[PDB]
Design a protein around this ligand. Structure first.
Ligand SMILES: C[C@@H](O)C(=O)SCCNC(=O)CCNC(=O)[C@H](O)C(C)(C)COP(=O)(O)OP(=O)(O)OC[C@H]1O[C@@H](n2cnc3c(N)ncnc32)[C@H](O)[C@@H]1OP(=O)(O)O
Ligand SMILES: C[C@@H](O)C(=O)SCCNC(=O)CCNC(=O)[C@H](O)C(C)(C)COP(=O)(O)OP(=O)(O)OC[C@H]1O[C@@H](n2cnc3c(N)ncnc32)[C@H](O)[C@@H]1OP(=O)(O)O
Ligand SMILES: C[C@@H](O)C(=O)SCCNC(=O)CCNC(=O)[C@H](O)C(C)(C)COP(=O)(O)OP(=O)(O)OC[C@H]1O[C@@H](n2cnc3c(N)ncnc32)[C@H](O)[C@@H]1OP(=O)(O)O
Ligand SMILES: CC1=C(CCOP(=O)(O)OP(=O)(O)O)SC(O)N1Cc1cnc(C)nc1N
Ligand SMILES: CC1=C(CCOP(=O)(O)OP(=O)(O)O)SC(O)N1Cc1cnc(C)nc1N
Ligand SMILES: CC1=C(CCOP(=O)(O)OP(=O)(O)O)SC(O)N1Cc1cnc(C)nc1N
Ligand SMILES: Nc1ncnc2c1ncn2[C@@H]1O[C@H](COP(=O)(O)OP(=O)(O)O)[C@@H](O)[C@H]1O
Ligand SMILES: Nc1ncnc2c1ncn2[C@@H]1O[C@H](COP(=O)(O)OP(=O)(O)O)[C@@H](O)[C@H]1O
Ligand SMILES: Nc1ncnc2c1ncn2[C@@H]1O[C@H](COP(=O)(O)OP(=O)(O)O)[C@@H](O)[C@H]1O
Ligand SMILES: [Cl-]
Ligand SMILES: [Cl-]
Ligand SMILES: [Mg+2]
Ligand SMILES: [Mg+2]
Ligand SMILES: [Mg+2]
Lengths: 558, 557, 558
């Protein structure tokens, strides 16, 4: 009818939803995760018309988590789309997690019409006010002709400097409001984030300090992965022959099988190093604040970070390298060519690191070899690690499940491990997996979660099936939070869940493949069948209720 | 060993977790929904030792929704317990919903140790700052000896006046910090919320206005359900013979089968009334702001609300009745004893209401009787409504599923319907159902959700199974958000999985699962699900294009 | 007497007030402006014991403005000390002004005792929450032993990166609480803010663009004055021969009498430039957003700013130079030597600039020479400018008084003009003057305020007299806000004040010298006497009610 090409069409006007979609596409947004509804249905449809991939989720929580993981994987702010009111409130989880991890993110939240403000409109809410404490940038788009301006400013703010979350509030009457095409002020395309360099004397001072250290340690954080500095870091470590330690999501910047990794002697390396070189890593709880009882009280610090305000937190920095990871390590490699220095091939430090790695390997070897059922964590990961392709993207989530999987699942390329992060968040699991499968559909995506962690976002398995994402979900079920629990007229323990739950049947609700494992003899065949199945799958593994990690001198939290 | 009763034990000291547990119990907290972890594990354990019922959920979203539902059902603030950092941020969902619905709740969020503030500690976060815009009350507990003070003040703030959410921040070193039991200052027990009355002239002016109206309408909102005013409201309606309209969760304050209800002629009643008596209901979007095009421009308003600031919002109130719903309607009943007036037995207003009711009944009658498969919404509810016990607690969630279920599922007692509420929230479904099953285990609990709504909180079925809650989950699956979609070109943003076998989720956790696609299967499946001694899911594949009855006005406008 | 040295004393403990004083002194805080009272009296007393200069003001509003001006003048965060409750709320003015100008400052606010929280204590308030939106950093000090930690972190957060305000909340029980001196954990001394450099290809790209421009313009902002980049900028301008425009408080980075200044042809220079080089200046309202109708639609931008997120705001930047102004201009000077280029001595661009300067000079020449009484603004500034020493510190505040004074009072060294700034704030006048008199007591401090501006902070004249600060306050009184008003059965107009007010008698209330000027013949002798008076002085000049600035093609705001 009105879709006949023979009829006269106005064709001069454009509405806010369309301008938003074009601006997002211009600014490099390729993925949009969310849940539609009033008033954002036109936004999702217009985004699809511009070629943006829209992924409809089952909860805004996972959608806001998927958005920032896709941002991390692409190096580019990607979008989360939620409805007014509780849509935005649900998505506050992702804003908080993206702020704490320094990951970019664009949350687009619908709002009730401006003309109804004050009246008690449907899902009326002070949305910019609620989001502001968790965002680098948060603003309401008051008029549709200003959409290109706001999308450019929001993307730029989220991407430049220390990355973080941006929020755009889209009222209903702005989404549907129309303006003349020829009257809309265009906006420039946001390019690559600016890279800054360190002063030359800071470069030379860092090398001076490295040459003088008896027990140096390089710590590779996920700031280097975000900076895409892996080439420069690998050259720097190879030329200096310096021992290095990867952070949880810094794994892969250096290959985990590199002979200079101290990952198997982590506590001794932190305890005994006289100099620590922080590469895109913070002295927060992940690295135990750089302070006793985990470090020498007199540890010297070279700190490379883009955030000037981060320099010297908790432990003073002897040499500060403020700027971009890739750029500054490039400076170090250039300055190394004039020094002709490397850490000597034989030092007591190297011998102590090697002895500790072998001691820790012998401590967990019987647990890895133990075929008895119900299985311990290390036995389970023996079969899992042996079936992980070298280009896989690993999502890990839980307490023991995640921590033990971190040391038992090596990464050989950067940006290939996504876990609970600097916020210790449960609920990122399947959202991260959906984002990884959307961004890199040619690579296998394996999520290894505990039974508690799986419950936070397990409904998103339907999302993966609906979009043909062959995500492999492996659940390590001990029947509780961190540990199992003997079944109780006493009430159930607060940490207890269901040890006999058949989570794999959730995969069969949505056309995926489900596998249940209780004996070690079943694990191999089940994992083989799950990996070969052309589609998403769940392997539910009932592990020992009392299985625990390797004993250590220090508690992880302390 | 150290627990041998022969061993000398020092018993003088108590820590913050135990103080928190004793204070919550003293203040009437019987239910605590949450997810444990650093640092709140001692709090949940201590709560159970005091006899508090701890319910471990699967997401803090549902835990915060369950807490406010339990508060609405019990009449006292109930607790939601979450870990530091993302635990609180996940729980902000429930604070906002409780704020908007004027429902109390107490959120107890753990926090990182005070002595590590600034260091980038595990899950360090400005938690009070984040929660403050969503709460009536939000404060950190800085020392464990002040826990009785803060619990009393938080519960009192949540419960008294216009109810709302309260937040208490519990740092790790306060939870584990010890004090001498004899040195802790006790706190008074928070009693019932104060009830206030209206001036006598306002009472008389309200009754004078009722006598003068040609087309009066009483609107009964959930503020009367919160106020426990059902006895007084029923006496008021039976005395005055006035037509009434229930709001969505005001259903049941008056029985939905009462002959004075105008529910089946709702649009006509709002449009043509010359006087509206608001009982604990707002002129917000749920009542279309009391303005055109849904009301007469000159509609006269009697407004009963506890909140003085709410009086006259959008539409001016000719008579204001600021105070408690139960006390004020009691005043009206007492003042009516001196008047011979009642709304007459036969008026053109009654005839117009009755005719419009019959017209809407005949408009939906063919759909209710249509046994065509895949079924429409009204046909599905024909079998559901015939099997709902009259004392059931009904949870409704979705768009078409919820709105059509609102008209097809009558409630005969108050506080027995829990739905998306004033915030239009998807995600409250199984959290509300778990709350209802915990508070009223002797009553049946039936949640009717759309397929989209179920996806928000479906994992909480494991919670119901783990606690032996025989919740009956009925899913109306059209394969999308509000309506279905043809199979795919990428999938439509609103599309879900029409062929999904959601009922197998019940079988993951020991419940009964039922799949219905034909009308002949619906009856036997509902029979078996209601009779099964445990939780159950009935997954009904409905027509992808089934819709609600056509109306003159869109619900939103 | 308990003060006799013969008596045994404890000496082993220290309270929070003393730890705060020692930490502030260690971190380079030399000046503390505030008003004492519960609970901060011990803090100011302890600060004086460590040698910190305490300045007791008459309103926290001016104290908070003084602290940030002293921070700008010293290059390090200086302190404002206020009481609980309304003391902090009064001081929010300074936090907002410091945020908008990117100036550092440390606000120290007392709080009611922690043990009384919730009870309705005296001046109990959510002080961190109120201050947080206006601060880079805001935190409460919960225990006295962590004071060194928080002071270090607050000073560093205010000073590093883009500077801004930091707030520390000091409860009464923390101020008076005692700890063992040997158990207090020390904190490192905050050094100079880190400097970052631009990548070399960006440096060369900037020089390439400069060589290609037909009508280039360098804009020198107060970011270069903060960065102490004046010598690098002066070398760059001398070697490139580029015309330059100074921003309001950028005046002095280049001397105002420099022949390359386009200040006398500002509108034409911005309108016609084909390339603009922003040096530590933003495209905000002060530079008219870098957009039409004040700029060419195709103007090319080289942008030097420390804040990566600011790059490309309103007008896209062709070359981004993210880093420190001093460091990056140093790179440009070094890279300039590799080439053989300067902007030619004879171009149509230079002729157009010189013609507009001469035209604008001839437009105001009659007003400057007009001895008519009541005097116009330009006539008043003829006598003021002739008596301003070349090393003076000038404070300007008002509308016409400030804007006309900006062009009539040249500065020849940087950081010597303090005015309403990027926030357009009235109320900074005597607070800025007191700060300048405290930081540079060996230099003359002259504040030229309109009559409305003086009323905001005029009581601080007592502060100047109490501390022996010979501040010279010159008031231009037209009897209203922006303009005069005829005498009023009619109420006074909202902008009207008192044209016949004798503000100079305020000086005689506090021991200063007051001078009243109505005729041009009195102006010179009055200024001579005020400048020679060995103390603070007020010269109250009753100017014409309808005196105005020279007409322009565009309104300053637009
Ligand atoms: S609940 C709340 C949820 N919680 C979270 O969200 C926090 C997540 N938690 C973390 O982020 C980490 O927990 C930290 C904080 C970074 C600490 O780190 P971490 O102490 O856990 O260290 P990591 O996990 O790397 O290794 C553990 C031990 O295994 C040794 N090890 C490593 N690799 C091998 C190998 N291949 N073979 C044999 N042994 C190995 C290693 O050497 C060390 O033993 P050690 O050296 O201490 O004796
Ligand atoms: C789609 C997706 O992207 C979304 O973003 S959605 C967002 C989620 N959405 C919500 O959160 C909205 C919740 N929505 C509401 O809260 C209600 O919608 C209101 C706002 C209160 C309006 O109310 P309401 O207009 O819907 O009225 P009600 O539901 O009571 O009844 C309907 C018609 O059935 C007639 N009727 C009643 N009873 C019987 C009977 N027994 N037999 C025959 N007919 C009957 C009655 O008379 C009327 O017909 P009428 O009188 O107008 O001709
Ligand atoms: C409503 C009222 O109550 C208020 O609420 S107020 C609020 C308080 N308000 C503020 O907070 C804003 C302060 N305002 C500014 O920040 C400036 O306003 C800008 C925004 C930077 C624009 O700048 P500007 O347009 O004012 O230009 P500038 O002041 O530099 O010079 C003026 C004209 O004099 C020419 N000129 C310069 N030097 C000489 C000389 N030596 N001889 C002869 N002529 C000269 C120059 O060329 C130009 O003339 P043009 O080129 O346009 O023809
Ligand atoms: C529940 C929970 C965990 C599960 C461990 O149990 P799971 O079965 O997943 O793994 P297990 O250790 O192999 O048994 S960790 C944790 O910190 N936490 C608290 C926690 C709760 N909520 C949020 C949002 N973030 C959290 N961080
Ligand atoms: C998804 C969604 C709905 C489901 C309708 O689809 P469902 O299958 O549940 O029911 P149907 O109508 O029978 O098909 S309603 C709605 O407002 N909304 C948007 C919505 C999204 N997120 C949140 C927190 N609140 C919302 N309100
Ligand atoms: C009153 C006022 C001004 C005085 C001009 O009158 P004044 O006698 O000082 O100078 P005149 O122009 O020579 O007469 S400017 C201005 O923006 N403003 C509004 C103004 C008010 N309050 C604050 C905090 N900031 C402001 N910016
Ligand atoms: N391009 C970049 N170059 C260098 N550092 C960066 C860059 N982007 C972000 N960073 C910094 O990297 C740090 C990441 O630290 P963190 O998340 O604690 O690492 P990890 O958790 O791996 O130890 C942040 O402090 C952030 O400021
Ligand atoms: N005890 C009480 N007595 C009277 N009114 C109350 C009481 N408690 C709450 N209210 C009011 O009841 C109203 C509920 O309105 P609303 O949630 O819009 O109801 P509905 O959704 O049923 O229309 C709120 O405005 C609240 O102030
Ligand atoms: N050390 C520094 N080097 C370079 N730029 C800086 C430095 N410190 C601050 N800046 C920048 O200087 C800019 C000041 O701009 P603005 O206050 O608008 O100047 P003006 O008002 O003089 O135009 C801010 O954007 C700030 O980020
Ligand atoms: Cl019961
Ligand atoms: Cl000096
Ligand atoms: Mg577990
Ligand atoms: Mg549906
Ligand atoms: Mg004036």
């Amino acid at each position: 009818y009105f879709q006949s090409n023979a009829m006269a069409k106005s064709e001069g006007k454009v509405n806010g939803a369309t301008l938003m979609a074009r601006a997002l596409q211009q600014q490099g947004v390729q993925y949009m995760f969310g849940i539609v509804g009033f008033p954002v249905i036109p936004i999702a449809i217009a985004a699809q018309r511009e070629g943006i991939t829209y992924i409809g989720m089952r909860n805004e929580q996972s959608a806001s988590y998927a958005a920032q993981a896709a941002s991390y994987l692409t190096g580019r702010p990607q979008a989360c789309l939620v409805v007014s009111g509780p849509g935005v409130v649900h998505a506050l989880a992702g804003l908080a997690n993206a702020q704490v991890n320094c990951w970019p993110m664009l949350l687009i939240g619908g709002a009730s019409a401006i003309e109804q403000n004050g009246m008690g409109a449907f899902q009326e809410e002070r949305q910019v006010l609620l989001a502001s404490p968790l965002c680098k940038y948060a603003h309401q788009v008051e008029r549709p002709e200003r959409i290109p301006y706001y999308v450019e400013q929001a993307v730029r703010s989220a991407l430049f400097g220390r990355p973080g979350a941006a929020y755009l509030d889209m009222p209903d009457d702005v989404i549907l409001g129309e303006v003349e095409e020829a009257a809309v002020r265009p906006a420039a395309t946001v390019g690559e984030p600016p890279r800054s360099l360190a002063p030359q004397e800071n470069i030379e001072a860092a090398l001076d300090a490295l040459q003088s250290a008896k027990r140096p340690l390089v710590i590779v954080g996920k700031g280097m992965a975000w900076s895409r500095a892996e080439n420069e870091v690998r050259q720097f470590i190879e030329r200096t022959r310096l021992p290095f330690l990867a952070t949880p999501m810094g794994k892969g910047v250096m290959p985990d099988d590199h002979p200079l990794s101290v990952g198997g002697a982590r506590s001794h390396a932190l305890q005994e190093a006289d100099l620590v070189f922080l590469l895109g890593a913070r002295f927060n709880w992940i690295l135990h604040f750089g302070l006793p009882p985990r470090y020498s009280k007199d540890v010297r610090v070279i700190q490379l970070d883009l955030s000037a305000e981060e320099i010297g937190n908790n432990r003073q920095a002897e040499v500060a390298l403020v700027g971009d990871g890739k750029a500054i390590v490039g400076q170090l490699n250039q300055a190394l060519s004039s020094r002709q220095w490397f850490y000597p091939a034989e030092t007591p430090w190297r011998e102590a690191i090697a002895a500790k790695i072998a001691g820790n390997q012998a401590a967990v070897a019987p647990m890895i070899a133990d075929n008895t059922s119900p299985m311990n964590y290390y036995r389970v990961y023996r079969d899992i690690a042996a079936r992980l392709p070298r280009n896989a993207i690993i999502v890990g989530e839980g307490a023991n499940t995640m921590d033990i999987g971190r040391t038992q699942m090596p990464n050989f390329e950067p940006r290939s491990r996504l876990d609970a992060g600097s916020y210790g968040t449960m609920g990122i699991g399947l959202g991260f997996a959906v984002a990884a499968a959307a961004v890199h559909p040619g690579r296998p995506v394996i999520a290894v979660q505990g039974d508690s962690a799986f419950g936070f976002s397990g409904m998103e398995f339907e999302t993966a099936a609906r979009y043909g994402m062959p995500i492999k979900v492996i659940i390590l079920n001990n029947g509780g939070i961190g540990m199992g629990s003997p079944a109780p007229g006493q009430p159930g323990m607060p940490h207890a869940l269901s040890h006999d739950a058949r989570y794999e049947r959730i995969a069969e609700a949505f056309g995926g493949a489900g596998f249940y494992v209780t004996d070690s003899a079943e694990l191999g065949p089940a994992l083989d069948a799950a990996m070969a199945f052309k589609g998403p799958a769940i392997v539910n593994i009932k592990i020992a209720a009392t299985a625990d990690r390797k004993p250590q001198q220090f508690n992880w939290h302390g």
